[PDB]
Coordinates of C-alpha atoms in Angstrom, one line a residue:
Chain A
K1 CA 283.9 -146.9 30.2
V2 CA 281.6 -149.9 29.2
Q3 CA 278.2 -149.8 30.9
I4 CA 275.7 -152.5 30.0
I5 CA 272.4 -151.9 31.9
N6 CA 269.7 -154.4 31.3
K7 CA 266.8 -153.1 33.3
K8 CA 263.1 -153.0 33.4
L9 CA 261.9 -150.3 35.9
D10 CA 264.1 -147.5 37.1
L11 CA 262.0 -145.0 39.1
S12 CA 258.5 -146.3 38.3
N13 CA 255.1 -146.8 39.8
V14 CA 253.2 -149.7 38.2
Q15 CA 249.8 -151.3 38.7
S16 CA 249.2 -154.3 36.5
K17 CA 246.1 -156.5 36.1
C18 CA 245.1 -154.8 39.3
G19 CA 241.5 -154.9 40.4
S20 CA 239.9 -156.6 37.5
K21 CA 237.9 -159.7 36.3
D22 CA 235.6 -159.8 39.3
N23 CA 232.0 -161.0 39.0
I24 CA 229.8 -158.9 41.3
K25 CA 226.2 -160.1 41.6
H26 CA 223.2 -159.0 43.7
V27 CA 219.9 -161.0 43.7
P28 CA 217.8 -159.7 46.6
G29 CA 214.3 -160.5 47.5
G30 CA 214.0 -156.9 48.3
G31 CA 215.1 -154.0 50.5
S32 CA 218.8 -154.7 50.3
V33 CA 222.0 -152.7 49.7
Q34 CA 225.3 -153.8 48.1
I35 CA 228.2 -151.4 47.9
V36 CA 231.5 -152.5 46.3
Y37 CA 233.9 -149.6 46.9
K38 CA 236.6 -150.5 44.4
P39 CA 238.9 -147.7 43.3
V40 CA 242.3 -148.3 41.8
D41 CA 244.4 -145.2 42.5
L42 CA 248.0 -144.4 41.8
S43 CA 249.3 -141.1 43.1
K44 CA 252.7 -139.5 43.0
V45 CA 252.8 -136.2 45.0
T46 CA 255.9 -134.1 45.3
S47 CA 255.1 -130.9 47.1
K48 CA 258.3 -128.8 47.9
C49 CA 257.5 -125.8 50.0
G50 CA 259.7 -122.8 50.1
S51 CA 260.8 -120.8 53.1
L52 CA 257.5 -119.4 54.3
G53 CA 254.8 -121.1 52.1
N54 CA 251.7 -123.1 52.7
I55 CA 251.0 -126.3 50.7
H56 CA 247.5 -127.7 51.4
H57 CA 247.4 -130.9 49.4
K58 CA 243.8 -132.0 50.0
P59 CA 242.4 -134.0 47.0
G60 CA 239.4 -135.6 48.8
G61 CA 238.1 -139.1 48.2
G62 CA 235.0 -141.1 47.5
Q63 CA 231.8 -140.7 49.5
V64 CA 228.9 -143.1 49.2
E65 CA 225.8 -142.4 51.2
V66 CA 222.6 -144.5 51.2
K67 CA 219.7 -143.2 53.2
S68 CA 216.3 -144.9 53.5
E69 CA 214.1 -143.0 56.0
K70 CA 211.0 -145.2 55.7
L71 CA 210.5 -148.5 53.9
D72 CA 207.7 -151.0 54.1
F73 CA 207.0 -154.5 52.8
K74 CA 203.4 -155.3 53.6
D75 CA 203.3 -158.7 52.1
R76 CA 205.4 -161.7 51.0
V77 CA 208.8 -161.0 49.8
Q78 CA 209.6 -164.2 47.9
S79 CA 212.4 -165.2 45.6
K80 CA 212.9 -168.7 44.1
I81 CA 216.2 -169.3 42.3
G82 CA 217.0 -172.3 40.2
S83 CA 220.5 -171.3 39.4
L84 CA 222.8 -168.4 38.8
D85 CA 225.8 -168.2 36.5
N86 CA 226.1 -171.6 34.8
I87 CA 229.6 -171.1 33.5
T88 CA 231.7 -173.6 31.5
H89 CA 235.3 -172.6 31.0
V90 CA 237.3 -175.0 28.8
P91 CA 240.6 -173.6 27.5
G92 CA 243.0 -175.7 25.4
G93 CA 246.6 -176.3 26.5
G94 CA 249.8 -176.3 24.5
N95 CA 250.6 -172.6 25.0
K96 CA 254.1 -171.1 25.3
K97 CA 255.3 -168.2 27.3
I98 CA 259.0 -167.6 26.5
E99 CA 261.1 -164.8 28.0
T100 CA 264.8 -164.9 26.9
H101 CA 267.5 -162.6 28.3
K102 CA 270.7 -163.1 26.4
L103 CA 273.7 -160.9 27.3
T104 CA 277.0 -161.9 25.7
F105 CA 280.4 -160.3 25.9
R106 CA 283.2 -161.1 23.4
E107 CA 286.6 -159.9 22.5
Chain B
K1 CA 285.5 -149.8 33.8
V2 CA 283.2 -152.7 32.9
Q3 CA 279.8 -152.6 34.5
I4 CA 277.2 -155.3 33.7
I5 CA 273.9 -154.7 35.6
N6 CA 271.2 -157.2 35.0
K7 CA 268.3 -155.8 37.0
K8 CA 264.6 -155.7 37.1
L9 CA 263.4 -153.0 39.6
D10 CA 265.7 -150.2 40.7
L11 CA 263.6 -147.7 42.7
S12 CA 260.1 -149.0 42.0
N13 CA 256.7 -149.4 43.5
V14 CA 254.8 -152.3 41.9
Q15 CA 251.4 -153.8 42.5
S16 CA 250.7 -156.9 40.3
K17 CA 247.6 -159.0 39.9
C18 CA 246.7 -157.3 43.1
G19 CA 243.1 -157.3 44.2
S20 CA 241.4 -159.1 41.3
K21 CA 239.4 -162.1 40.2
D22 CA 237.1 -162.2 43.2
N23 CA 233.5 -163.4 42.9
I24 CA 231.3 -161.3 45.2
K25 CA 227.7 -162.4 45.5
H26 CA 224.7 -161.3 47.6
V27 CA 221.4 -163.3 47.6
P28 CA 219.4 -162.0 50.5
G29 CA 215.8 -162.8 51.5
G30 CA 215.5 -159.1 52.2
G31 CA 216.7 -156.2 54.4
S32 CA 220.4 -157.0 54.2
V33 CA 223.6 -155.0 53.6
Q34 CA 226.9 -156.2 52.0
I35 CA 229.8 -153.8 51.8
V36 CA 233.1 -154.8 50.2
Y37 CA 235.5 -152.0 50.7
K38 CA 238.2 -152.9 48.3
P39 CA 240.5 -150.1 47.1
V40 CA 243.9 -150.8 45.6
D41 CA 246.0 -147.7 46.2
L42 CA 249.6 -146.9 45.5
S43 CA 251.0 -143.6 46.8
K44 CA 254.4 -142.1 46.7
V45 CA 254.5 -138.8 48.7
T46 CA 257.6 -136.7 48.9
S47 CA 256.9 -133.4 50.8
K48 CA 260.1 -131.5 51.5
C49 CA 259.3 -128.4 53.7
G50 CA 261.5 -125.4 53.8
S51 CA 262.7 -123.4 56.7
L52 CA 259.4 -122.0 57.9
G53 CA 256.7 -123.6 55.8
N54 CA 253.6 -125.7 56.4
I55 CA 252.8 -128.8 54.4
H56 CA 249.3 -130.2 55.1
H57 CA 249.2 -133.4 53.1
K58 CA 245.6 -134.5 53.7
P59 CA 244.2 -136.5 50.8
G60 CA 241.2 -138.0 52.5
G61 CA 239.8 -141.5 52.0
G62 CA 236.6 -143.5 51.3
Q63 CA 233.5 -143.0 53.3
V64 CA 230.6 -145.5 53.0
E65 CA 227.5 -144.7 55.1
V66 CA 224.3 -146.7 55.0
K67 CA 221.4 -145.5 57.1
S68 CA 218.0 -147.1 57.4
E69 CA 215.8 -145.2 59.8
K70 CA 212.7 -147.4 59.6
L71 CA 212.2 -150.7 57.8
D72 CA 209.3 -153.2 58.1
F73 CA 208.6 -156.6 56.7
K74 CA 205.0 -157.4 57.6
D75 CA 204.9 -160.9 56.1
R76 CA 206.9 -163.9 55.0
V77 CA 210.4 -163.2 53.7
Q78 CA 211.1 -166.4 51.9
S79 CA 213.9 -167.5 49.6
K80 CA 214.4 -170.9 48.1
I81 CA 217.6 -171.5 46.3
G82 CA 218.4 -174.6 44.2
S83 CA 221.9 -173.6 43.3
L84 CA 224.2 -170.7 42.7
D85 CA 227.3 -170.5 40.4
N86 CA 227.5 -174.0 38.8
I87 CA 231.0 -173.5 37.4
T88 CA 233.0 -176.1 35.4
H89 CA 236.7 -175.1 34.9
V90 CA 238.6 -177.5 32.7
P91 CA 241.9 -176.1 31.4
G92 CA 244.3 -178.2 29.3
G93 CA 247.9 -178.9 30.3
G94 CA 251.1 -179.0 28.4
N95 CA 251.9 -175.3 28.8
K96 CA 255.4 -173.8 29.1
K97 CA 256.7 -170.8 31.1
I98 CA 260.4 -170.3 30.3
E99 CA 262.5 -167.5 31.8
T100 CA 266.2 -167.6 30.7
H101 CA 268.9 -165.4 32.0
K102 CA 272.2 -165.9 30.1
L103 CA 275.1 -163.7 31.0
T104 CA 278.4 -164.8 29.4
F105 CA 281.8 -163.2 29.6
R106 CA 284.6 -164.0 27.1
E107 CA 288.1 -162.9 26.1
Chain C
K1 CA 287.0 -152.8 37.3
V2 CA 284.7 -155.7 36.5
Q3 CA 281.3 -155.5 38.2
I4 CA 278.7 -158.2 37.3
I5 CA 275.5 -157.5 39.2
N6 CA 272.7 -160.0 38.6
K7 CA 269.9 -158.6 40.7
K8 CA 266.1 -158.5 40.8
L9 CA 265.0 -155.7 43.3
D10 CA 267.3 -152.9 44.4
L11 CA 265.2 -150.4 46.4
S12 CA 261.8 -151.7 45.7
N13 CA 258.3 -152.1 47.2
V14 CA 256.4 -155.0 45.6
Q15 CA 253.0 -156.5 46.2
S16 CA 252.3 -159.5 44.0
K17 CA 249.1 -161.6 43.7
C18 CA 248.2 -159.8 46.9
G19 CA 244.6 -159.9 48.0
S20 CA 242.9 -161.7 45.1
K21 CA 240.8 -164.6 44.0
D22 CA 238.6 -164.7 47.0
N23 CA 234.9 -165.8 46.8
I24 CA 232.8 -163.7 49.0
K25 CA 229.2 -164.8 49.4
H26 CA 226.2 -163.7 51.4
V27 CA 223.0 -165.6 51.5
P28 CA 220.9 -164.3 54.4
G29 CA 217.4 -165.0 55.4
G30 CA 217.1 -161.3 56.2
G31 CA 218.3 -158.5 58.3
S32 CA 222.0 -159.2 58.1
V33 CA 225.2 -157.3 57.5
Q34 CA 228.4 -158.5 55.8
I35 CA 231.4 -156.2 55.6
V36 CA 234.7 -157.2 54.0
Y37 CA 237.1 -154.4 54.5
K38 CA 239.8 -155.4 52.0
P39 CA 242.1 -152.6 50.8
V40 CA 245.5 -153.4 49.4
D41 CA 247.6 -150.3 50.0
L42 CA 251.3 -149.5 49.2
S43 CA 252.7 -146.2 50.5
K44 CA 256.1 -144.7 50.4
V45 CA 256.2 -141.4 52.3
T46 CA 259.4 -139.3 52.6
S47 CA 258.7 -136.1 54.4
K48 CA 261.9 -134.1 55.1
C49 CA 261.1 -131.1 57.3
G50 CA 263.4 -128.0 57.3
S51 CA 264.6 -126.0 60.3
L52 CA 261.3 -124.6 61.5
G53 CA 258.6 -126.2 59.4
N54 CA 255.5 -128.2 60.0
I55 CA 254.6 -131.4 58.0
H56 CA 251.2 -132.7 58.7
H57 CA 251.0 -136.0 56.7
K58 CA 247.4 -137.0 57.4
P59 CA 245.9 -139.0 54.5
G60 CA 242.9 -140.5 56.2
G61 CA 241.5 -144.0 55.7
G62 CA 238.3 -145.9 55.1
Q63 CA 235.2 -145.4 57.1
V64 CA 232.3 -147.8 56.8
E65 CA 229.2 -147.0 58.9
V66 CA 226.0 -149.1 58.8
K67 CA 223.1 -147.8 60.9
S68 CA 219.7 -149.3 61.2
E69 CA 217.6 -147.4 63.7
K70 CA 214.4 -149.5 63.5
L71 CA 213.8 -152.8 61.7
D72 CA 211.0 -155.3 62.0
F73 CA 210.2 -158.8 60.7
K74 CA 206.6 -159.5 61.6
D75 CA 206.5 -163.0 60.0
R76 CA 208.4 -166.0 59.0
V77 CA 211.9 -165.4 57.7
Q78 CA 212.6 -168.6 55.9
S79 CA 215.3 -169.7 53.6
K80 CA 215.8 -173.2 52.1
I81 CA 219.1 -173.8 50.3
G82 CA 219.8 -176.9 48.2
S83 CA 223.3 -175.9 47.3
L84 CA 225.7 -173.1 46.7
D85 CA 228.7 -172.9 44.3
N86 CA 228.8 -176.4 42.7
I87 CA 232.4 -176.0 41.3
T88 CA 234.4 -178.6 39.4
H89 CA 238.0 -177.6 38.8
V90 CA 240.0 -180.1 36.6
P91 CA 243.2 -178.7 35.2
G92 CA 245.6 -180.8 33.2
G93 CA 249.2 -181.5 34.2
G94 CA 252.4 -181.6 32.3
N95 CA 253.2 -177.9 32.6
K96 CA 256.7 -176.5 32.9
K97 CA 258.1 -173.5 34.9
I98 CA 261.7 -173.0 34.1
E99 CA 263.9 -170.3 35.6
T100 CA 267.6 -170.4 34.4
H101 CA 270.3 -168.2 35.7
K102 CA 273.6 -168.7 33.8
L103 CA 276.5 -166.5 34.7
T104 CA 279.8 -167.7 33.1
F105 CA 283.2 -166.1 33.2
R106 CA 286.0 -167.0 30.7
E107 CA 289.5 -165.9 29.7
Chain D
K1 CA 120.1 -165.5 86.0
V2 CA 122.2 -162.4 86.5
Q3 CA 125.8 -162.6 85.2
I4 CA 128.0 -159.5 85.4
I5 CA 131.4 -160.3 84.0
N6 CA 133.9 -157.4 84.0
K7 CA 136.9 -158.9 82.3
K8 CA 139.9 -157.9 80.2
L9 CA 141.4 -161.0 78.5
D10 CA 139.5 -164.3 78.2
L11 CA 141.6 -166.6 76.0
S12 CA 144.2 -164.3 74.7
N13 CA 147.9 -164.0 73.8
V14 CA 149.2 -160.5 74.2
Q15 CA 152.6 -158.9 73.7
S16 CA 152.7 -155.3 74.6
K17 CA 155.6 -152.7 74.4
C18 CA 157.6 -155.8 73.8
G19 CA 161.1 -155.5 72.4
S20 CA 161.2 -151.7 71.6
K21 CA 163.0 -148.4 72.2
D22 CA 166.5 -149.8 72.2
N23 CA 169.4 -147.8 71.0
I24 CA 171.8 -150.1 69.1
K25 CA 175.1 -148.5 68.1
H26 CA 178.3 -149.8 66.5
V27 CA 181.4 -147.6 66.1
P28 CA 184.3 -149.9 65.2
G29 CA 187.8 -149.0 64.2
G30 CA 187.5 -151.7 61.7
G31 CA 187.0 -155.4 61.1
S32 CA 184.2 -156.0 63.6
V33 CA 180.8 -157.7 63.7
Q34 CA 177.7 -156.8 65.7
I35 CA 174.6 -159.1 65.5
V36 CA 171.5 -158.3 67.4
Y37 CA 169.1 -161.2 66.8
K38 CA 165.9 -159.6 68.1
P39 CA 162.7 -161.2 66.8
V40 CA 159.4 -160.8 68.6
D41 CA 157.3 -163.8 67.7
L42 CA 153.8 -164.9 68.8
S43 CA 152.6 -168.3 67.7
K44 CA 149.5 -170.2 68.4
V45 CA 149.6 -173.7 66.8
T46 CA 146.7 -176.1 67.1
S47 CA 147.5 -179.3 65.1
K48 CA 144.8 -182.0 65.6
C49 CA 145.8 -185.2 63.9
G50 CA 143.3 -187.8 62.9
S51 CA 143.5 -191.6 63.3
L52 CA 146.4 -192.3 60.9
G53 CA 147.7 -188.9 59.8
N54 CA 151.0 -187.1 59.8
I55 CA 151.4 -183.5 60.8
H56 CA 154.9 -182.1 60.3
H57 CA 154.7 -178.6 61.7
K58 CA 158.2 -177.3 60.8
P59 CA 158.1 -173.5 60.3
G60 CA 161.9 -172.9 60.5
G61 CA 163.6 -169.9 62.0
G62 CA 166.2 -167.2 61.5
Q63 CA 169.7 -168.0 60.2
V64 CA 172.5 -165.4 60.3
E65 CA 175.8 -166.4 58.8
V66 CA 178.8 -164.1 58.6
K67 CA 181.9 -165.5 56.9
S68 CA 185.2 -163.7 56.3
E69 CA 187.7 -166.0 54.7
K70 CA 190.6 -163.5 54.5
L71 CA 190.9 -160.0 55.9
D72 CA 194.0 -157.8 56.3
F73 CA 194.7 -154.4 57.8
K74 CA 198.2 -153.5 56.8
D75 CA 198.4 -150.2 58.7
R76 CA 197.1 -148.1 61.5
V77 CA 193.4 -148.7 62.4
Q78 CA 192.8 -145.6 64.5
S79 CA 189.6 -144.1 65.8
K80 CA 189.3 -141.0 68.1
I81 CA 185.9 -140.4 69.6
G82 CA 185.0 -137.2 71.4
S83 CA 181.4 -138.2 72.3
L84 CA 178.5 -140.3 71.2
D85 CA 174.8 -139.7 71.8
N86 CA 174.6 -136.4 73.8
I87 CA 171.0 -136.8 74.8
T88 CA 169.0 -134.4 77.1
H89 CA 165.6 -135.7 78.1
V90 CA 163.5 -133.3 80.1
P91 CA 159.8 -134.1 80.4
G92 CA 157.4 -132.1 82.4
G93 CA 155.4 -133.5 85.3
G94 CA 151.8 -133.0 86.3
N95 CA 150.4 -135.9 84.2
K96 CA 147.4 -138.1 85.2
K97 CA 146.7 -141.8 84.5
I98 CA 143.3 -142.6 85.8
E99 CA 141.7 -146.1 85.6
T100 CA 138.3 -146.3 87.2
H101 CA 136.3 -149.5 87.6
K102 CA 132.8 -148.8 89.0
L103 CA 130.4 -151.8 89.4
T104 CA 127.3 -150.9 91.3
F105 CA 124.3 -153.1 92.1
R106 CA 120.9 -151.6 93.2
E107 CA 117.4 -152.7 94.0
Chain E
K1 CA 121.8 -166.8 90.5
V2 CA 123.9 -163.6 90.9
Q3 CA 127.5 -163.9 89.6
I4 CA 129.7 -160.9 89.8
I5 CA 133.2 -161.7 88.3
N6 CA 135.7 -158.8 88.4
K7 CA 138.7 -160.3 86.6
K8 CA 141.6 -159.4 84.5
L9 CA 143.1 -162.5 82.8
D10 CA 141.2 -165.8 82.5
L11 CA 143.2 -168.1 80.3
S12 CA 145.9 -165.8 79.0
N13 CA 149.5 -165.6 78.0
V14 CA 150.9 -162.1 78.5
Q15 CA 154.3 -160.5 77.9
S16 CA 154.4 -156.8 78.9
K17 CA 157.3 -154.3 78.6
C18 CA 159.3 -157.4 78.0
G19 CA 162.8 -157.1 76.5
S20 CA 162.9 -153.4 75.8
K21 CA 164.7 -150.1 76.3
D22 CA 168.2 -151.5 76.4
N23 CA 171.2 -149.5 75.1
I24 CA 173.6 -151.9 73.2
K25 CA 176.9 -150.3 72.2
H26 CA 180.0 -151.6 70.6
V27 CA 183.1 -149.5 70.2
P28 CA 186.0 -151.8 69.2
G29 CA 189.5 -150.9 68.3
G30 CA 189.2 -153.7 65.7
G31 CA 188.6 -157.4 65.1
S32 CA 185.9 -157.9 67.7
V33 CA 182.5 -159.6 67.8
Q34 CA 179.4 -158.7 69.8
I35 CA 176.3 -160.9 69.6
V36 CA 173.1 -160.0 71.5
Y37 CA 170.8 -162.9 71.0
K38 CA 167.5 -161.4 72.2
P39 CA 164.3 -162.9 71.0
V40 CA 161.0 -162.4 72.8
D41 CA 158.9 -165.5 71.9
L42 CA 155.4 -166.5 73.1
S43 CA 154.2 -169.9 72.0
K44 CA 151.0 -171.8 72.7
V45 CA 151.1 -175.3 71.1
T46 CA 148.2 -177.7 71.4
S47 CA 148.9 -180.9 69.4
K48 CA 146.3 -183.5 70.0
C49 CA 147.2 -186.8 68.3
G50 CA 144.7 -189.4 67.3
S51 CA 144.9 -193.1 67.7
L52 CA 147.8 -193.9 65.3
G53 CA 149.1 -190.5 64.2
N54 CA 152.4 -188.8 64.2
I55 CA 152.8 -185.1 65.2
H56 CA 156.3 -183.7 64.6
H57 CA 156.2 -180.2 66.0
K58 CA 159.7 -179.0 65.1
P59 CA 159.6 -175.2 64.6
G60 CA 163.4 -174.6 64.7
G61 CA 165.2 -171.6 66.3
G62 CA 167.8 -169.0 65.7
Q63 CA 171.3 -169.8 64.4
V64 CA 174.0 -167.2 64.5
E65 CA 177.4 -168.2 63.0
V66 CA 180.4 -166.0 62.7
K67 CA 183.5 -167.4 61.0
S68 CA 186.7 -165.6 60.4
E69 CA 189.2 -167.9 58.8
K70 CA 192.2 -165.5 58.5
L71 CA 192.5 -162.0 59.9
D72 CA 195.6 -159.8 60.3
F73 CA 196.3 -156.4 61.8
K74 CA 199.9 -155.5 60.7
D75 CA 200.1 -152.2 62.6
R76 CA 198.8 -150.1 65.5
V77 CA 195.2 -150.7 66.4
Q78 CA 194.5 -147.6 68.4
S79 CA 191.3 -146.1 69.8
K80 CA 191.1 -143.0 72.0
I81 CA 187.7 -142.3 73.6
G82 CA 186.8 -139.1 75.4
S83 CA 183.3 -140.1 76.3
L84 CA 180.3 -142.1 75.2
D85 CA 176.6 -141.5 75.8
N86 CA 176.5 -138.2 77.8
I87 CA 172.9 -138.5 78.9
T88 CA 171.0 -136.1 81.1
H89 CA 167.5 -137.4 82.2
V90 CA 165.5 -134.9 84.2
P91 CA 161.8 -135.8 84.4
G92 CA 159.3 -133.7 86.5
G93 CA 157.3 -135.1 89.4
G94 CA 153.8 -134.6 90.4
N95 CA 152.3 -137.4 88.3
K96 CA 149.4 -139.6 89.3
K97 CA 148.6 -143.3 88.7
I98 CA 145.2 -144.1 90.0
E99 CA 143.6 -147.5 89.8
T100 CA 140.1 -147.7 91.5
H101 CA 138.1 -150.9 91.9
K102 CA 134.7 -150.2 93.3
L103 CA 132.2 -153.1 93.7
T104 CA 129.1 -152.2 95.7
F105 CA 126.1 -154.4 96.5
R106 CA 122.8 -152.8 97.6
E107 CA 119.2 -153.9 98.4
Chain F
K1 CA 123.5 -168.1 94.9
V2 CA 125.6 -165.0 95.3
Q3 CA 129.2 -165.3 94.0
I4 CA 131.5 -162.3 94.1
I5 CA 134.9 -163.1 92.6
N6 CA 137.4 -160.3 92.7
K7 CA 140.4 -161.8 90.9
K8 CA 143.3 -160.9 88.8
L9 CA 144.8 -164.0 87.1
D10 CA 142.8 -167.3 86.8
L11 CA 144.9 -169.7 84.6
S12 CA 147.5 -167.3 83.3
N13 CA 151.1 -167.1 82.3
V14 CA 152.6 -163.6 82.7
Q15 CA 156.0 -162.1 82.2
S16 CA 156.1 -158.4 83.1
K17 CA 159.0 -155.9 82.8
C18 CA 161.0 -159.1 82.3
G19 CA 164.5 -158.8 80.7
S20 CA 164.6 -155.1 80.0
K21 CA 166.5 -151.8 80.5
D22 CA 170.0 -153.3 80.5
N23 CA 172.9 -151.3 79.2
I24 CA 175.3 -153.6 77.4
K25 CA 178.6 -152.1 76.3
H26 CA 181.7 -153.4 74.7
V27 CA 184.8 -151.3 74.3
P28 CA 187.7 -153.6 73.3
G29 CA 191.2 -152.8 72.3
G30 CA 190.8 -155.5 69.8
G31 CA 190.3 -159.2 69.2
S32 CA 187.5 -159.7 71.7
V33 CA 184.1 -161.4 71.9
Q34 CA 181.0 -160.5 73.9
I35 CA 177.9 -162.7 73.7
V36 CA 174.8 -161.8 75.7
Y37 CA 172.4 -164.7 75.1
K38 CA 169.2 -163.1 76.4
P39 CA 165.9 -164.6 75.2
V40 CA 162.7 -164.1 77.0
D41 CA 160.5 -167.1 76.2
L42 CA 157.0 -168.1 77.3
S43 CA 155.8 -171.5 76.2
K44 CA 152.6 -173.4 76.9
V45 CA 152.6 -176.8 75.4
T46 CA 149.7 -179.3 75.7
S47 CA 150.4 -182.4 73.7
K48 CA 147.7 -185.1 74.3
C49 CA 148.6 -188.3 72.5
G50 CA 146.1 -190.9 71.6
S51 CA 146.2 -194.7 72.0
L52 CA 149.1 -195.4 69.6
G53 CA 150.4 -192.1 68.4
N54 CA 153.8 -190.3 68.4
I55 CA 154.2 -186.7 69.4
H56 CA 157.7 -185.4 68.8
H57 CA 157.6 -181.8 70.2
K58 CA 161.1 -180.6 69.3
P59 CA 161.1 -176.8 68.7
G60 CA 164.9 -176.2 68.9
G61 CA 166.7 -173.3 70.4
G62 CA 169.3 -170.7 69.8
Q63 CA 172.8 -171.5 68.6
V64 CA 175.6 -168.9 68.6
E65 CA 178.9 -170.0 67.1
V66 CA 181.9 -167.8 66.8
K67 CA 185.0 -169.2 65.1
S68 CA 188.3 -167.4 64.4
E69 CA 190.7 -169.8 62.8
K70 CA 193.7 -167.4 62.6
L71 CA 194.0 -163.9 64.0
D72 CA 197.1 -161.7 64.3
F73 CA 198.0 -158.3 65.8
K74 CA 201.5 -157.5 64.8
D75 CA 201.7 -154.2 66.6
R76 CA 200.5 -152.1 69.5
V77 CA 196.8 -152.6 70.4
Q78 CA 196.2 -149.5 72.5
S79 CA 193.1 -147.9 73.9
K80 CA 192.9 -144.9 76.1
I81 CA 189.5 -144.1 77.7
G82 CA 188.7 -140.9 79.5
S83 CA 185.1 -141.9 80.4
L84 CA 182.1 -144.0 79.3
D85 CA 178.5 -143.2 80.0
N86 CA 178.4 -140.0 81.9
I87 CA 174.7 -140.3 83.0
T88 CA 172.8 -137.9 85.3
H89 CA 169.4 -139.1 86.4
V90 CA 167.4 -136.6 88.4
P91 CA 163.6 -137.4 88.7
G92 CA 161.3 -135.3 90.7
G93 CA 159.3 -136.7 93.6
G94 CA 155.7 -136.2 94.7
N95 CA 154.2 -139.0 92.6
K96 CA 151.3 -141.2 93.6
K97 CA 150.5 -144.9 93.0
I98 CA 147.0 -145.6 94.3
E99 CA 145.4 -149.1 94.1
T100 CA 142.0 -149.2 95.8
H101 CA 139.9 -152.4 96.2
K102 CA 136.5 -151.6 97.6
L103 CA 134.0 -154.5 98.0
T104 CA 130.9 -153.6 100.0
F105 CA 127.9 -155.8 100.9
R106 CA 124.6 -154.2 102.0
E107 CA 121.0 -155.2 102.8

């Protein structure tokens, strides 16, 4: 008769704040490789075959190739660094995060 | 008759704050490789075959190849570093995180 | 008759704050390899075969290859480091995390 | 009374065929020095000083300086030689060198 | 009365065929020094001082300096030689060297 | 009365065929020094001092300096030699060297 359903996710697939805010840096003297393979995927595959069929679910993924067949440095590779990324991060306090769930029955 | 269902995730698949906020750095003198293989995947595969069928669920993944067939450094690879990443992080206090779950029955 | 279900996860698959906030660094003199294989995966596979079928659930994973067939350093690989990552982290106190679960029956 | 003086050198200073006919060769791959210091000198110094004098006989000689403050070869110094100086020397015979000294007295 | 003087050198200083016909060769791969210090000198010094004098007979000689303050070969110094100096020397015979000294007295 | 003087050198200083016909060779792979210090000198010094004088007979000689303050070979010094100096020397015979000294007295 009476159905009260407070609910947030029923049949769901959630990625939240997921793979973010990351400082990648690369300061080489020379001849160097940095690879940051960072996908954020969300799949939902439902492949119902019937009675004689053929489902070939083959989506394929990332390929990263780096080749360097010849490479020479015939003198001084030099790199002087005073500093990187002089960051000052001063946030102010006094913030409020309020989540209220009121569920009241009466007669 | 009376059904009160306070609930947050029923049939769910959640990634939250998941694989984030990471400082990757790379300061080589030279001839160096950094690989950070960092995917954040979420799959939900439901492959119902029928009675004679063939399901070939083959999505494939990441490939990272780095080849370097010849590489020479015929003099001084030198790297002087004073500092990296001079970070000051001063947040203010006095914050509030309030989660209230009120569920009241009456007659 | 009366069903009160306070509940947070029913049939769920949760990753939270899961694989994050990690400072990776790499300061080589030269000729060096760093690999941080850090995926955060969440799968949910339900493969119901029928009566003669063939399910081949083969998603494949990460491959990281690094080859270096020849590599020479014919002089001084030198690296002087004063400091890395001079971090000051001063958060203020006086914060509140309040989780209230009130469940009251009356007549 | 009778003076017969057959003679060839009385007060003499002779150099003959003296420092000649010499094949100097130099086939370097690179960065090489050949010095052939080959003077042929003939001096005759007669310095008669008198009673308070000063004779400073200082003629000075050869100076050969070769300086090379910096020198680099940053790749393959290669030199393939099939042959040098293919010389055929066929003189014919039947030559005559006749030196006759006849000194005859009669009355 | 009768003086017959057959003679060839009275007060003499002779160098003959003296320091000649010499094949000097130099085939380096690289970075090499050959010095052939080959003077042929003939001096005759007669320094008669008188009664208070000063004779300073200081003619000086050869100086050969070779300096190489820095020198680098950063790859293959290679030298393949098939042959040097393929010489064929075929002189014909039947030559004559005749030196006749006839000194005859009669009355 | 009668003086017959057959004679060849009275007060003489002779160098003959003296320091000649010498094959010097130098085939280095690299970084090598050959020095052939080969002077052929002939002096005749007659320094007659008188009664208070000073004779300083100081002619000086050869100096050969070779300096190499730094020298590097950062790869293969290689030298393949098939042959050097393929010499064939075929002189013909039947030569004559005749030295005749006839000294005859009669009345």
